[PDB]
Amino acid sequence: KLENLKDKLPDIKSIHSKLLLRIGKLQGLYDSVQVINREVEGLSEGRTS
Amino acid sequence: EQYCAPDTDIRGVDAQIKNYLDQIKMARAKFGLENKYSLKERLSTLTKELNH
Fold this sequence. Notes:
This is part of a larger assembly, with chains A and B.
Chain A: H1 10-43
Chain B: H1 15-20, H2 45-51
Subcellular location (chain A): Nucleus
Protein name (chain A): THO complex subunit MFT1
Subunit structure (chain A): Component of the THO complex, which is composed of HPR1, MFT1, THO2 and THP2. Together with SUB2, TEX1 and YRA1, THO forms the transcription/export (TREX) complex. THO associates with DNA and RNA in vitro.
């Protein structure tokens, strides 16, 4: 059963490429929340234009 | 919720914040000016003329 190890390899390349996709999405949600917390800090200083 | 729902570009939803982040002071300077003095001095003289 270990002789081929051929058609069992690209179905782990598939589930590993979706996980690296889901990491980069939620790493982008934690970079737009840190934009909202830079505006609400600066706006509640008192200086708007 | 649109960052994690599938089949979406990331840069197309990052521009929905720049829309939202400027619609939040276009409603805070619309009630921070009409409540500043145009409704302050309508209650300044009218509470003196009630007392008299």
